[PDB]
A paper describes a structure:
[name] is a bacterial/archaeal type IA DNA topoisomerase that catalyzes the ATP-dependent introduction of positive supercoils into DNA. The general architecture of [name] has become evident from crystal structures of the enzymes from Archaeoglobus fulgidus and [name]. Both enzymes are large (>120 kDa) monomeric entities that consist of a helicase domain containing the ATP-binding site and a type IA topoisomerase domain fused on the same poly­peptide chain. The two parts of [name], the helicase domain and the topoisomerase domain, are structurally connected by the latch, an insertion in the helicase subdomain H2. The latch couples the activity of the helicase domain to strand passage.
Here, we report the crystal structure of [name] [name] containing this minimal latch at 2.9 Å resolution. To gain insight into the structural basis for this differential effect on activity, we determined the crystal structure of rgyr_minlatch. Although rgyr_minlatch crystallized in a different space group, the overall structure is similar to the structure of the full-length enzyme, revealing a padlock shape. Equally small r.m.s.d. values are observed for the individual helicase domains (0.94–0.98 Å) and topoisomerase domains (0.52–0.67 Å), demonstrating that deletion of the globular domain of the [name] [name] latch has no significant effect on the [name] structure outside the latch. The minimal latch formed by residues 387-PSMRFSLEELIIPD-400 emanates from the H2 sub­domain and retains its short β-sheet, i.e. the first and last four residues of the sequence. In contrast to β-turns, which have a length of four residues, the loops in β-bulges consist of five or six residues, distinguished as type 1 and type 2, respectively. Typical of type 2 β-bulge loops, the minimal latch in rgyr_minlatch forms a hydrogen bond between the NH group of residue i (Phe391) and the carbonyl group of residue i + 5. The twist is a result of Phe391, the first residue in the β-bulge loop, rotating its side chain into a void that is normally occupied by Phe401. Deletion of the globular domain entails the removal of Phe401, apparently prompting Phe391 to fill the void and maintain van der Waals interactions with the methylene groups of Glu850 in the T3 region of the topoisomerase domain. Apart from Ile398 in the β-sheet, the location of which is the same in all [name] structures, Phe391 is the only residue that makes any interaction with the topoisomerase domain.
Author numbering: 2 to 1041
The structure:
């Protein structure tokens, strides 16, 4: 622990508790002074301080009682899915059962109703078919005790049985009612006035047919009509409804959704019960993609003699399908078609009378999408790449989405085992194949291998082994995993490759649920930081106890209207008085309640110092609720990044946390003290936000004097059939004589890949953009899974990055110029590089075509520079011929070096290498003399300041862009026509006051030394408390 305090972290009183006790899982000193109690609940009870821990105590008791009852009557323990479902039942929550198909769904809801019946609560079970009503009734009465009241309603009942159901209904003398969806459709008003405690529906599509059916269920769980009218008016208006907290609804559970609720009516569940009817887009796929370079039927015949059984063939058009169906019928293949007798032929394929089925590639074709039997469909073959027609031209592009659907029919989660499938493409067109490969890489991150690198025997052995493992009864391994990030955009990228099935609205945040082979995966976004230092108390929010400093933190509040952020516990914004506050206290409370339901929790913030501090704040808060907390750092937001991050799962690195604390303290103490001294002088407030800001302003102010001092003389000479020459001073002669000419060969190496500083400088200069916007574009590209982590100080490139470079060069047929370079061996992160072998031109094509739609042209250009920078670093050295020409101008000898030829290509393909006209050993005439003055020391630009900051050891990748932009926001600097930064009159006299009284606390030497100290703290090489002592004495000198 880092010995800090948080203002709402106590799990029992909701008040202030220290860092250490939360880590140990204990309440604050006020609630329970004992460090090591036998039981926290009993100790709180004895001291008569038991306020909120009673809820968790009853929650675990209720869940354990539920699970105990399940094992007693079912005989088995709760699976991972049913473990999460049970933890929500005892909490009174309503949800959608997000899981693969199986008998575990109906059995759980049947067991849940029995458990509620044992508590005296009444339940209702709805089934699509009257047959399912009878079977579940049979399962109930076999297991239910004789005391339990179970009644049913279907069409073929006894006359006495129908009357005994109704009579038990009107007298309210029942515990479980088991009727079909037809009963709900025909008895809306009869159920509309009764309030049940649990409703289980097996088919959601029977209810989606009528909006009245949705309202009937909401009436059944105890929602007033006055609430429905306001909610329906809000959603039809396009907004989100807020519930009355005093409402006590029932429990609604949905089993499986075919996910076709086009109407707005299902969205009423999201606003009225905080759960989403799931559009189960399952991304759990394991498919090998192989391309065969021709459409030779002989190879197809040979391939089918290997695959033998369970084969689908997709033709582009019906005529091609008819030809293939006839061709394989003349040959002795058991084949069937789908375009005429779809129903009969597919059933023959299911049972085994047909080995091969032929269809047509439609985006939502019945064979392409409307079939689901992976246990039989093992191999999918495409007789041509599926394609679409894009815009009004005849331009033909691959239909990647149709390919993903058709190939996906061979792989899904079946009986808890994710089966393996094979997709084979017969494509003669190389360019169409290349277009599909990158499209599949962007969406599915799945490669396509060539024919010569595929072992058919091993692949089919893998296919049959996986299915034979799925068909036998499996031992459950499912776990419920929680993923916590801080950025909403990162969560959206996660939902694209994990697959958003359902979504829950938990107080201030939204939690999405997805199906994976390991079980259920939950993920949510924090929307920024959770804690920050309090403004008042002690030394500007830092207390002192036992000679050590304790930082005090409180939850962040962000006003949604004006955006002002503050830490004080206030109902309204202190600047604009609005009450539309993004309150992180509710975010923390939501995470604590989620931590109860999940088996495992992983914090996945950014992999830097700022992200690590956020991770510890969340983990220490969530520790009193669950002990299953760990940390993962993702360097790319992709499937590969998530897998690699989980493989390096670890605990919280406290050295990173302490580095953040000392960095924030330095800005707080130095800034507040300088702001106060500047407050009295120049009137305004918050004029200084750290030591680094003052130092950089000093560079800009003093640059004006030395820029003017450095004015030397130059003369522009344009020579006939030659380049322009800049010579010093006034040149009188009109003839330039070449006296020496040497021509040489060299191998020019490329520039290293981008770091945060180098990317900020080069991109800002070339795109005429400020360094703050470039940083934001870098952040978006990383958060959307296009580049590696953008806050980096290293040029290190891993073998995987080199592997990406080789893959692209192999694609473009220029594999020969590949040259793997690891660059630096030092560095926490890699350099800024693309994560997939896609260049900006292909990205722009898929943006113009709409495969992706949230990248602006500024994002494209920034990505283009990064991609070219990285591949230049991975390309072979360029061979060039140059010349060293010595010329005499006015008796002055001047040597010029210029590249004249490019003998061998290399990284010059990605970064252009300028050549110059060849020089001869003769005299040259001057056409024009452009006389002008240029200063030896040029002024500052935004790119140059960042470049100057790193070379001087000032600033960090997390601060470079921030430091520059703060000067503009304070009005200390401006930009002229040529985008040079220039100090304002206010900025000069602000720096003038500091440089004349407080140079010791502002000077560059102090800034660099403190930065190196804090970097040593980050590595754990210097003491955390000692560093704070040094900061205290420095500010205490000027405090008076
Ligand atoms: Cl065969
Ligand atoms: Zn307490
Ligand atoms: Zn053969
Ligand atoms: Zn406000």
């Amino acid at each position: 622990a880092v010995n800090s305090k948080y203002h709402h972290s106590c799990i029992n009183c909701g008040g202030l508790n220290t860092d250490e006790r939360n880590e140990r899982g204990l309440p604050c000193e006020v609630c329970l002074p004992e460090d090591s109690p036998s039981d926290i609940y009993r100790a709180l009870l004895e001291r008569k301080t038991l306020k909120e821990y009673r809820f968790y105590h009853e929650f675990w008791n209720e869940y354990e009682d539920f699970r105990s009852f399940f094992k007693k009557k079912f005989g088995k323990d709760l699976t991972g899915y049913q473990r999460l479902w049970a933890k929500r039942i005892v909490q009174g929550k309503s949800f959608t059962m997000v899981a693969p198909t199986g008998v575990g769904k109906t059995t759980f809801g049947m067991m849940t109703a029995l458990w509620l019946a044992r508590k005296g609560k009444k339940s209702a079970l709805v089934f699509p078919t009257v047959t399912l009503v009878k079977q579940t009734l049979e399962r109930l009465q076999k297991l239910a005790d004789e005391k339990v009241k179970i009644f049913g309603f279907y069409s073929s009942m006894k006359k006495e049985e129908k009357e005994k159901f109704e009579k038990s209904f009107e007298e309210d003398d029942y515990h479980i009612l088991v009727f079909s969806t037809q009963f709900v459709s025909k008895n809306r008003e009869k159920l509309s006035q009764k309030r049940f405690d649990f409703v289980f529906v097996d088919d959601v599509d029977a209810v989606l047919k009528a909006s009245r059916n949705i309202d009937t269920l909401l009436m059944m769980v105890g929602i007033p009509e006055e609430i429905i009218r306001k909610a329906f008016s809000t959603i039809k208006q396009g907004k989100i409804y807020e519930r009355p907290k005093n409402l006590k609804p029932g429990i609604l559970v949905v089993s499986s959704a075919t996910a076709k609720p086009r109407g707005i009516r299902p969205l009423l569940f999201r606003d009225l019960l905080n759960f989403t009817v799931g559009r189960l887009v399952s991304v759990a796929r394991n498919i090998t993609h192989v391309r065969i370079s021709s459409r030779s039927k002989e190879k197809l015949v040979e391939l089918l003699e290997i695959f033998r059984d369970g084969i689908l063939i997709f033709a582009q058009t019906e005529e091609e399908g008819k030809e293939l169906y006839e061709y394989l019928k003349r040959f002795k293949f058991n084949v069937g078609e789908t375009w005429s007798e779809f129903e009969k032929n597919f059933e023959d394929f299911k049972v085994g009378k047909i080995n091969i089925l032929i269809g047509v590639q439609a985006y939502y074709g019945k064979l392409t999408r409307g079939v689901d039997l992976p246990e039989r469909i093992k191999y999918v073959i495409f007789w041509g790449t599926p394609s679409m027609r894009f815009s009004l031209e005849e331009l033909i592009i691959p239909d990647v989405y149709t390919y993903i659907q058709a190939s996906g029919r061979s792989s899904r989660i079946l009986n808890g085992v994710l089966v393996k499938g094979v997709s084979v493409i017969f494509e003669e067109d190389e360019e169409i194949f290349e277009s599909l490969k990158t499209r599949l890489l962007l969406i599915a991150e799945e490669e396509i291998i060539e024919e010569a690198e595929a072992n058919w025997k091993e692949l089919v052995h893998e296919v049959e082994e996986s299915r034979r493992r799925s068909e036998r009864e499996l031992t459950d391994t499912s776990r419920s995993l929680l993923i916590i990030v801080e950025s909403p955009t990162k969560a959206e990228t996660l939902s694209r490759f994990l697959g958003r099935a359902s979504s829950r609205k938990e107080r201030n945040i939204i939690v999405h649920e997805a199906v994976t082979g390991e079980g259920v995966i939950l993920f949510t976004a924090t929307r920024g930081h959770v804690y920050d230092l309090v403004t008042k108390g002690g030394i500007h929010g830092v207390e002192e106890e036992n000679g050590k400093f304790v930082p005090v933190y409180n939850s962040l509040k962000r006003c949604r209207d004006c955006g002002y952020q503050f830490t004080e516990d206030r109902d309204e914004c202190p600047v604009c008085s609005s009450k539309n506050i993004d309150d992180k206290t509710e975010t923390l409370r939501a995470l604590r309640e989620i931590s109860l339901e999940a088996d495992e929790i992983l914090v996945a913030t950014d992999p830097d110092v700022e992200g690590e501090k956020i991770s510890w704040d969340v983990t220490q808060y969530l520790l009193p609720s669950t002990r299953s907390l760990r940390r993962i750092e993702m360097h790319e937001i992709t499937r590969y990044g998530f897998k690699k991050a989980r493989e390096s799962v670890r605990f919280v690195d406290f050295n990173l946390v302490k580095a953040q604390i000392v960095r924030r303290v330095q800005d707080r103490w130095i800034g507040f003290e300088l702001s106060g001294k500047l407050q009295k002088r120049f009137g305004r407030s918050n004029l200084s936000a750290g030591r680094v800001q003052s130092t950089v302003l000093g560079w800009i102010v003093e640059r004006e004097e030395e820029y003017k001092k450095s004015e030397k003389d130059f003369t522009l000479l344009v020579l006939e059939n030659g380049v322009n020459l800049e010579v010093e001073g006034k040149i009188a002669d009109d003839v330039v004589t070449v006296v020496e000419l040497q021509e040489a060969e060299e191998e020019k190496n490329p520039l290293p890949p981008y770091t945060t500083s180098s990317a900020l400088s080069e991109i800002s200069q070339k795109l005429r953009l400020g360094v703050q916007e470039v940083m934001d574009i870098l952040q978006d590209l990383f958060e959307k899974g296009f580049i590696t982590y953008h806050r980096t100080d290293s040029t290190r490139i891993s073998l995987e990055g080199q592997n990406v470079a080789r893959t692209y060069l192999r694609k473009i047929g220029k594999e020969d110029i590949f040259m793997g370079r690891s660059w630096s061996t030092e560095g926490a992160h890699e350099a800024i590089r693309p994560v997939k072998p896609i260049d900006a031109r292909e990205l722009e094509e898929m943006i113009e075509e709409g495969l992706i739609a949230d990248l602006t042209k500024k994002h494209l250009r920034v990505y283009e520079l990064i991609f070219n920078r990285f591949l230049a670093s991975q390309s072979a050295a360029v061979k060039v011929k140059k010349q060293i020409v010595t010329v005499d101008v006015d008796g002055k000898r001047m040597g010029i070096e210029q590249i004249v030829e490019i003998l061998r290509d290399g990284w010059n393909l990605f970064v252009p290498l300028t050549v110059s006209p060849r020089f001869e050993h003769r005299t040259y005439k001057i056409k024009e003399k452009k006389f002008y003055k240029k200063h030896t020391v040029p002024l500052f630009t935004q790119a140059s300041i960042v470049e100057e900051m790193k070379k001087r050891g000032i600033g960090r990748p997390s601060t470079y862009a921030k430091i520059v932009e703060v000067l503009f926001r304070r009005g200390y600097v401006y930009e002229d026509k040529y985008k040079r930064v220039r100090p304002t009159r206010f900025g000069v006299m602000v720096y003038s006051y500091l440089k004349e009284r407080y140079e010791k606390y502002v000077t560059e030497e102090t800034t660099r030394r403190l930065e190196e100290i804090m970097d040593k703290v980050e590595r754990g090489e210097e003491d955390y408390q000692a560093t704070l002592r040094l900061l205290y004495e420095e500010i205490k000198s000027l405090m008076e």
